[PDB]
Amino acid sequence: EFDLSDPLALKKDRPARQSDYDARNTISGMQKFMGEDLNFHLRKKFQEEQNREW
Amino acid sequence: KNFINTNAADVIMGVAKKPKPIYVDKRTGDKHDLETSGLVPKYINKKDYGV
Amino acid sequence: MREIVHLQAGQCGNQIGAKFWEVISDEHGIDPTGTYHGDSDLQLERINVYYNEATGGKYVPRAVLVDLEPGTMDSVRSGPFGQIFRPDNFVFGQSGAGNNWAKGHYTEGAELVDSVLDVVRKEAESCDCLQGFQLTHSLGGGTGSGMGTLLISKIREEYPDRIMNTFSVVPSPKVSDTVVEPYNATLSVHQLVENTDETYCIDNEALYDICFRTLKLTTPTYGDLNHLVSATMSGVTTCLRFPGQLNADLRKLAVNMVPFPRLHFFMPGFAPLTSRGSQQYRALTVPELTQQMFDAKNMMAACDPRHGRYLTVAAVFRGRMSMKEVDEQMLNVQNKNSSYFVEWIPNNVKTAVCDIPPRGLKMSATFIGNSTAIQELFKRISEQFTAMFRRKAFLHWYTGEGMDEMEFTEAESNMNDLVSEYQQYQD
Amino acid sequence: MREIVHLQAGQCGNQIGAKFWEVISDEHGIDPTGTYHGDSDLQLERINVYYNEATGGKYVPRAVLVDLEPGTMDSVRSGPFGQIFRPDNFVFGQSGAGNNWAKGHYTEGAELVDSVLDVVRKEAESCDCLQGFQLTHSLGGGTGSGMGTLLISKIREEYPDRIMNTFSVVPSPKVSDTVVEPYNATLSVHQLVENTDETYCIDNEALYDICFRTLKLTTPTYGDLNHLVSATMSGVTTCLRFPGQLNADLRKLAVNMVPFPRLHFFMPGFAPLTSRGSQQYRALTVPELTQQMFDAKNMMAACDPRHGRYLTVAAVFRGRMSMKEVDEQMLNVQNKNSSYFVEWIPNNVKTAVCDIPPRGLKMSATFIGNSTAIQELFKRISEQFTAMFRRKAFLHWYTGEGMDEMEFTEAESNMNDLVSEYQQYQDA
Amino acid sequence: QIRLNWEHKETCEMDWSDKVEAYNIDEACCRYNNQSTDVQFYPHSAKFEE
Amino acid sequence: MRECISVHVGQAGVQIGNACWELYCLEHGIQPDGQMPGDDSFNTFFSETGAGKHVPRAVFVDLEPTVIDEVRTGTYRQLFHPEQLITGKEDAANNYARGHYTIGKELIDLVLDRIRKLADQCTGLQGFLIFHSFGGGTGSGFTSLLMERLSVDYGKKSKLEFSIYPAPQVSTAVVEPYNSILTTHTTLEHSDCAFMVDNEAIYDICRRNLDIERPTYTNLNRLIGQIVSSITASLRFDGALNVDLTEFQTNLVPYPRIHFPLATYAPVISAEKAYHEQLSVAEITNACFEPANQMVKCDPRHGKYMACCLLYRGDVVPKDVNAAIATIKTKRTIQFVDWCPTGFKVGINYQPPTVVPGGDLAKVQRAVCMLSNTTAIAEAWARLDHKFDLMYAKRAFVHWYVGEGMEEGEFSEAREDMAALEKDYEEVGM
Amino acid sequence: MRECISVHVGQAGVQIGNACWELYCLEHGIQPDGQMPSDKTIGGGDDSFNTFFSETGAGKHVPRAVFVDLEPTVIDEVRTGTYRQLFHPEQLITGKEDAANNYARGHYTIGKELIDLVLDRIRKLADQCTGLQGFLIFHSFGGGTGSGFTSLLMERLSVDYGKKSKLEFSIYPAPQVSTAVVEPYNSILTTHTTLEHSDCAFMVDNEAIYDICRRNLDIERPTYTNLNRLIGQIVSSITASLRFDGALNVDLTEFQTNLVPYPRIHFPLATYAPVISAEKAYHEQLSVAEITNACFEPANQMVKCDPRHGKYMACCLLYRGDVVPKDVNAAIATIKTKRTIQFVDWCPTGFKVGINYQPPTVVPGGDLAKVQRAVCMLSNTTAIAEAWARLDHKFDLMYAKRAFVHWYVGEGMEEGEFSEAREDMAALEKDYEEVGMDSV
Ligand SMILES: Nc1nc2c(ncn2[C@@H]2O[C@H](COP(=O)(O)OP(=O)(O)OP(=O)(O)O)[C@@H](O)[C@H]2O)c(=O)[nH]1
Ligand SMILES: Nc1nc2c(ncn2[C@@H]2O[C@H](COP(=O)(O)OP(=O)(O)OP(=O)(O)O)[C@@H](O)[C@H]2O)c(=O)[nH]1
Ligand SMILES: Nc1nc2c(ncn2[C@@H]2O[C@H](COP(=O)(O)OP(=O)(O)O)[C@@H](O)[C@H]2O)c(=O)[nH]1
Ligand SMILES: Nc1nc2c(ncn2[C@@H]2O[C@H](COP(=O)(O)OP(=O)(O)O)[C@@H](O)[C@H]2O)c(=O)[nH]1
Ligand SMILES: [Mg+2]
Ligand SMILES: [Mg+2]
């Protein structure tokens, strides 16, 4: 149990979501959601070009 | 208004502000309160004691 | 060993039960066809709490899915995890409830209550020592609020000594779907005080405030609000599924939270919620769980405890951590502010520590807190029951299913008594 | 474990705080991504006075950033060091105050305060032994002065044993930026009286007189005026971050310079400032700090102590230097200018020596000076209040948020006490 | 420059090792006195003075 | 032939017995799979069989399976016999009533059968040790039921207690006071000696003496095991003054209602503060009477000692022991009661304490464990009474106890009995 | 057998204790890391170090010291410096907030928290000692910890420990320069409350040692180490009769008996004569008469008061190195003949001498020379009655307007302790009068 009194754990600690795409971001770990919208801007511009040709 | 007169009278006709007592535990400087801890006798002084 | 039979009813109950069972199966390592593809051994040890066994190593859940229309559970049979639910557990009726408490309680759901009771009695006596049951429903609807309270009333006549829970979704004056949710909520919250051991409170206007002020989502859906409900639904039953330094089942939190048998309306909150852009500025440490879990901006009810007094407070930690730094932060909160804590209890807070964190995460915590601020939830609903009721607003819908106006009259003098029950400790 | 939670409010508050956090991070070796890339071992030993820690060796400051304009936050994130702040600590409203007091004290600033008082207790309770706060604001504007006197007023009532300072940018008469500023300046200085422990006065026309003449810059901007405000902001808090031969911190200075608790308006300065033409012509010796730090041209206020009396003097030195030459010049300026010191305090000068110089420099020194020559600052605001207030000038702008005209009346008699308290201690 | 520094480290450090062995020999020679044992006669050889 | 039968009740009992039996298996030369790679000094704890194995004389009891199943599939799974680790089906749930009446009655008879089977193999059995926790439901109710059933079957046999008393400031639960009062009142006449520990006090000792910030229950269990080994050392290792198990009761319990002593282990220091400091007999004797090293957060300078027992281990000499004791007999800080003119019992053992790999404490040559009986433990029952009043004025939590078959008069009679106990502690010191 | 427990309190006390305990490691054989390099007779060896160092089983010598502070940034340089393996970790006590130039914080509020932790550690050091002579204490009157807590430490040393001797070294505040504003109020309220609870008091001012270093040594622009290093040359010369062989031993009990006549007059004044630089020592012999006469020079005193305005009340002389006891006797008879130096009439004998053998130790980096002979002298003078007259002057000056008392009143102190602490000194300012007039 040296890790509980470790003075370098916060130095050698690594975040729960370091990047957007990583392996440990499943549904029980609640750092990843589906409603966060990425690819919203591209959906908006796709809809607007369809509106133009329409 | 005499501030030089009244600032003298503000401190004499009063009371000192007594602290909440504290004990420092370790050489690092860990400071606790004294009454809440189980050290000083406080609870045998109750009126419910021994009856 | 210690089984949990899951019951859920309504569109709100089924869309929560579709997301809770996805969380558990990722936590126990279950792929969407049934088998086990995990990596540890602790994932397969206590798996009979939720999953029954079948032939060929296939684990299917202990759920009963109830409704009154068929169109809700075709989107549950056709989702990602629609193939693991055993298809005889689905119970559906052909004509709905139509936002009516009466029609689901006396006419349409009186012919379907005895159809579900064959399913539960079949399978809750396949267990070896059933701990208790669980409901998840909506008080603002017609099926869960009218017939889900009918199943609660029937199974507490047959299995009395066990546990009942509800993750009830009481309505909201701000986020208001229907017009007639005052009548459905008031007639059901009188059915909750006599027949449930524990009962939480969930407002969709308080789940919105988490997805806008904490997780910063641009377009939250109902598929994100069900993620947060199911956060506080596995984190409560998490110490009889995994070992720990200090265990606590569902009954040990019932003993320590409710003083009097008519005072059991808690309100939840979950500790490591973090936005995407605020992700690398955080430290995953024990002080930073116990201090956002206690935040009034975090709670899963639309009532704030800065108006009332905390009767009791629970906390269920997960993850390998130190018992000294868990215990010093409960004394640190109880002593700074002795105006929000009741006096005839000297130590209000309970702690239990599991071992296995949520999958893909390091630490976690949950809050199950009993307050006298929960009475403003009822009187912001009972101020719109008697607003409608003095003019006999929508009453012809309800009287035609065989009730009387006395059933409407007793259900606010039972609701106001509980309001004045939680009131005498507020000062 | 002697922590400083640094508040800053207003556009003047935020873009001073963005520059103060550039000089601290270079002083402690923090690159703009947050991490630590220094070389020594004293740049990491006591860094928790200002910086918290996150995961991965990242350090984020203990700052809170407050404004009523949403368009001030994007100026903060446009600098080099705009990504070191945790994004929760920004507190932005939607509608500004716009050169007003009651708009910022009762109407809009009184409903923005209760979301900041969650954020300061968010951080003050997570310190091992908090020493006190700081504030940086301008009395001329409305966000910094209408609400920044209510930010002070709540936190003295909740935490009354700790320390509070203000680096107040009180308005100047010659650089008269806005017409309605004497009402904001007058009505807010009484809320500074009862609550604050220490208070400096940083006039903007005093900073212009340095950059025109001492540094000889052709085009000084506000980036070259926040440099001087923040070079004396970290020269006070420097010996509780780095070790010394004689120590002093924020509490010890308030003990020695404040003999009565209504007398806390100082006059900062900063010693080694030199133009580039006079750069190679200089000698880097000890009395070439004390000759400039005590020079009446060098002060950061727009008032002069040739008119009044030094009650006390502080001085903080930085650099490996000799205690005899540090101590003998203090005696040398006390004996010579023997008519500029009060009689009823006979050792008016307090001294500290800190070992570590600021990075890039060899020695340095910082001044804080308490005087009855700062009552001439308050009477010039009082002359342009009642020259303007007798004819009821802009009164409908203020009285329509539910002020009172007697509340205006009490706010010069609260100020005419300090201008006649400082007179009786000048007769002594 | 890295390999040059490691060469100089090795050189000064061999000097340190020789001084350690000579220090232990002179401690054992500083032990002795009259009624101490483990002292004995030796022939006079020129290797002693060389 | 000098056997001790250990009984562990509760999760505290199981998680303490893990560290204790690890220490014993490493103190003798016993593998984690029963074999030994001769002398019979193990025979007070381990019994040999016909397959070369040495199976312990213990009984682990819990009402909940997920704390003994880790023993059943841990490192030591081949050592423990499968029928010495008894598990219920559903726990007592912080309830004295459940742990005493409704749930402990299905589990009391099998443990009595196992204790009969173990005690019909010890030819020279000294007595039982009970390790339990006041706060928990099993460790209060079932432990008190076991103490009520032991005395009618074994009589004048020695039974000893290690108790996790409720800590003065931090507690894990809300319903600790009802459990504590209702176990004290009903075990008060069926117990011979009850040593106290407090988890908060051992937290302070691990934080301050050792440098282990953020300790854990295993770091506490190692020190508890060191204390147990020092108490039972002289029945196994050779000594200059042997202290048998039948003497702590005789020399620490003056009155049959006052059997509540407190424990200290003297050189609990780390591997950098053992390099700087010599650890002689006078230093380790003078450090047991220090109120910063006690294992209950209470101060004996506010009270009067009534009996003391000092156990010495290692490289110790009788005159150094004698000079240390006669120094501590001369402080005006250490005040004894009027009617205790002698005071002390001293025991001396040769074998130095045994180091576990992974442990905290360093390797030493000398150690002391001291069990002292003080009047200054009255404020503990005073705070316990006050918190029982604070809950019981408004009749809080009472249905949780009454619904499982116990009347409401037991609360009233338990508070009356422990009020009489407070007057006893008041009046014996004057 | 001849143990003495050093107590250091304050940043002034801690920084002095660094230079004192550097000297004691080279004066004996101990390395910075606590080992003698080798022992020529391992079973034998000399045990001279037991007055200061305590030896464990293996080889390690740990000092008999307690370093006290209320600010963390002073001791943490000791804790991670060269001598971080020499000191036992628990002897360096710190606080978390300093007492902040305040007698009230140092006595009543902040300093009354560490008092029951240092008293624990003092008993652990005072029970190793077979033959404890007395405690030494190093402090400064113008601090918070050096004035508040140190006045508190004497009071609970009187209760617990009885008559056991408690000698002081203090930094009395200099008359001209001073690094504080509330240095009067501390210096009055500490001198007043430690009259009955103190045994002796040797006083030195920083301004006076500045005069010697620029003039007698050649080092211009000194630093507080150059002042600290000279203080270690005084404490070693007091205690070197307890460790090294002597022709006249002087114990630590004989200073109070031979310099403190009356129960409110216990303030001698230190002086150390041959401090001359290593180029200016190349030219002049340093005989016993050349270094006896130099203690009596007011330009070589170690306090800023002149004894030519007052009467000597007693003297003490400690000699090191190569001195003949006959030539000691020749110089003292000479300094009696000069009528520039006057003794009080009721003290006809007025001396106490002590002759040692070990010459004082050269430390690398120090500015003195290697010298055979040395004198340290402690003399009690009536010309200290001019030092309280310039401290009455500067206490009442802030007390006319009652400046700064609001800091002290709300920190646990009633205001009536100001109008008794000075009015106590008024007796002491006229108590020094009645021993200053002849017996007609
Ligand atoms: N000091 C210490 N206390 C422990 C340890 N393990 C458990 N505890 C204590 O155990 C108490 C919790 O009660 P339980 O351990 O569950 O006792 P129980 O008899 O099993 O109670 P139930 O689970 O309801 O049957 C806490 O108050 C802890 O103080 C330990 O290793 N050391
Ligand atoms: N002679 C000498 N005096 C010193 C030395 N260091 C500090 N001083 C004195 O220290 C005094 C200032 O108070 P400090 O000792 O630094 O601080 P303190 O005693 O801890 O009191 P607080 O700062 O309030 O905690 C000044 O009067 C100096 O004369 C030193 O090394 N030698
Ligand atoms: N939080 C949450 N609320 C839901 C969900 N589905 C429906 N609701 C709410 O429940 C109410 C409608 O549910 P409803 O279909 O009438 O429930 P039913 O009558 O029992 O079938 C509305 O207030 C919705 O906002 C869900 O998945 N999550
Ligand atoms: N010294 C200095 N003065 C400033 C700065 N920013 C604004 N000011 C002065 O403050 C006044 C404008 O303040 P304003 O931003 O409107 O007040 P705020 O809204 O409270 O921040 C003008 O007189 C400016 O000269 C700055 O960064 N430094
Ligand atoms: Mg249990
Ligand atoms: Mg200090």
Residues from chain D contacting residue C291 (CB–CB below 8 Å): 125-126
SS3 G104: helix
Q: What phi and psi values does residue F29 have, to the nearest 5 degrees? A: -95, 50
How many angstroms separate the CA atoms of F182 and F100, rounded? 10
- The catalytic residue among G55, G155, G254, G386 is G254
Distances (CA, A) of G369 to D363, G227, G240, G274, G377: 32, 16, 19, 9, 19
Contact F269, F277 (CB under 8 A): yes
**Number of CB atoms found within 10 A of residue F363's CB:** 11
DSSP of D301-323: SS--TTSS-EEEEEEEEESS--H
Measure CB to CB from residue G177 to each of D245, D331, D344 and give the nearest one. D331
SS3 G160: helix
In angstroms, the first-to-last Cα distance of chain D is: 41
How many angstroms separate the CA atoms of D116 and D66, rounded? 8
CA torsion D351→D356→D362→D365, rounded to 10°? -30
Q: Do chains A and F touch (3 or more CB pairs under 8 A)?
A: yes
| Residue C69 in marked binding region | yes
Contact C279, C216 (CB under 8 A): no
Residues from chain D contacting residue A11 (CB–CB below 8 Å): 56-57
How many angstroms separate the CA atoms of D408 and G339, rounded? 77
C97 touches ligand 3 (CB under 6 Å): yes
How many angstroms separate the CA atoms of F308 and F343, rounded? 6
**Residue D356's closest CA among D38, D101, D53, D136?**
D38
**Residue C196's closest CA among C233, C166, C229?**
C166
- Least Cα separation, residue B2 to chain G (angstroms): 12
Q: Do chains D and C touch (3 or more CB pairs under 8 A)?
A: yes
Contact F338, F430 (CB under 8 A): yes
- Which letter, b or e, does each residue of G17-49 get, where b requires 16 or more Cβ atoms within 10 Å of its Cβ? bbbbbbbbbebbbbeeebebeeeeeeeeeeebb
Strand partners, F317: none
SS3 G197: coil
Closest atom of ligand 1 to F176 CA is 27
CA torsion D403→D404→D409→D412, rounded to 10°? -10
- D278 CA → ligand 2 middle, Å: 38
**Residue D304's closest CA among D259, D233, D369, D212?**
D369
Q: Token pair for residue D18?
A: 């963005």
Check CB contact under 8 Å for C220 and A18: no
DSSP state of B18: P
F205 touches ligand 1 (CB under 6 Å): no
SS3 D288: helix
**Residue D287's closest CA among D300, D299, D271, D276?**
D271
In angstroms, the first-to-last Cα distance of chain C is: 44
Residues in chain C: 427
3-state helix, strand, coil in chain A (%, to 5): 25, 0, 75
Q: Which residue has the tokens 């193990």?
A: F42
- Least Cα separation, residue G434 to chain D (angstroms): 30
DSSP state of D182: H
SS3 F346: strand
**After which residues do gaps appear in chain F, with C to N over 2.5 Å?**
37
Strand partners, C53: C59
In one letter, which amino acid is G51?
Answer: T
SS3 D405: helix
Q: Token pair for residue G71?
A: 């600010």
How many angstroms separate the CA atoms of F306 and F140, rounded? 28
Q: Token pair for residue F215?
A: 């300790």
- F87 CA → ligand 5 middle, Å: 10
In one letter, which amino acid is G175?
Answer: P
DSSP of F191-218: -SEEEEE-HHHHHHHHHHTS--SS--HH
Beta strands in G172-292 (DSSP E): 200-204, 268-272
With contact defined as 3+ CB pairs under 8 Å, the chains touching D are: A, B, C, G
Contact C197, C422 (CB under 8 A): no
Cβ-Cβ contacts under 8 Å for C334 (sequence gap 6 or more):
C341, C347, C348, C349
Chain G residue with the nearest C-alpha to that of B13: G415
Q: Left if phi > 0, otherwise alpha if psi is -120 to 50, otherwise beta: which for F127?
A: left
Among the bound ligands, name the one nearest to the CA of residue D98: 4
Residues from chain D contacting residue G113 (CB–CB below 8 Å): none
Distances (CA, A) of F66 to C245, C351, F72, F90, F347: 10, 18, 10, 10, 40
- Least Cα separation, residue D260 to chain G (angstroms): 7
How many angstroms separate the CA atoms of G366 and G232, rounded? 11
SS3 D161: coil
Strand partners, C244: C354
F272 is catalytic: no
Residues from chain F contacting residue C350 (CB–CB below 8 Å): 172-174
Q: What phi and psi values does residue D75 have, to the nearest 5 degrees? A: -70, -30
**Residue C284's closest CA among C217, C224, C368, C358?**
C358
| Residue G25, H or E segment | helix G11-27
Among the bound ligands, name the one nearest to the CA of residue F14: 1
SS3 D217: coil
**Number of CB atoms found within 10 A of residue D74's CB:** 10
Cβ-Cβ contacts under 8 Å for C224 (sequence gap 6 or more):
A33, A34, A35, C211, C215, C217
Q: Structure solved using which method?
A: cryo-EM
Residues from chain C contacting residue F175 (CB–CB below 8 Å): 255-256
Strand partners, G200: G167
Cα torsion angle, C158, C161, C163, C166, sign: positive
Closest residue by Cα to atom 4, ligand 3, is C12
**Number of CB atoms found within 10 A of residue D273's CB:** 15
The number of CA neighbours under 13 Å toward the Cβ of E16 is 6
In angstroms, the first-to-last Cα distance of chain F is: 44
- Least Cα separation, residue D148 to chain C (angstroms): 24
Among the bound ligands, name the one nearest to the CA of residue C18: 3
Chain D residue with the nearest C-alpha to that of C294: D122
Q: Which residue has the tokens 């081949």?
A: F78
Check CB contact under 8 Å for G403 and D243: no
Distances (CA, A) of G12 to C206, D358, F286, G200, G275: 59, 26, 33, 19, 22
How many angstroms separate the CA atoms of D299 and D304, rounded? 8
User: Is B3 an interface residue toward G (CB < 8 Å)?
Assistant: no
How many angstroms separate the CA atoms of F88 and F11, rounded? 12
How many angstroms separate the CA atoms of G341 and F281, rounded? 57
Q: Do chains E and F touch (3 or more CB pairs under 8 A)?
A: no
Cβ-Cβ contacts under 8 Å for D270 (sequence gap 6 or more):
D228, D231, D232, D235, D293, D298, D300, D364, D365, D366, D367
Q: Token pair for residue C34?
A: 């049934």
How many angstroms separate the CA atoms of D124 and D114, rounded? 15
Cβ-Cβ contacts under 8 Å for D143 (sequence gap 6 or more):
D9, D10, D11, D13, D66, D67, D68, D69, D96, D97, D104, D109
3-state helix/strand/coil string of chain C: CCEEEEEEEHHHHHHHHHHHHHHHHHHCCECCCCCECCCCCHHHCCHHHCEEECCCCCEEECEEEECCCCCCCCCCCCCCCCCCCCCCCEECCCCCCCCCHHHHHHHCCCCCHHHHHHHHHHHCCCCCCEEEEEECCECCCCCCCCCHHHHHHHHCCCCCCCECCEEEECCCCCCCCCCCHHHHHHHHHHHHHCCCCCEEEECHHHHHHHHHHCCCCCCCCHHHHHHHHCHHHHCCCCCCCCCEEECCCHHHHHHHHCCCCCCCEEEEEECCCCCCCCCCCCCCCHHHCCCCCCCCCCCCCCCCCCCCCEEEEEEEEECCCCHHHHHHHHHHHHHHCCCCECCCCCCCEEEEEECCCCCCCCCECEEEEEECCCHHHHHCCHHHHHHHHCCCCCHHHHHCCCCCHHHHHHHHHCHHHHHHHCCCCCC
Q: Token pair for residue E34?
A: 């009259």
Q: Token pair for residue C63?
A: 């759920």
Domains defined for chain C, CATH in brackets = 3-257 (3.40.50.1440), 265-374 (3.30.1330.20), 375-425 (1.10.287.600)
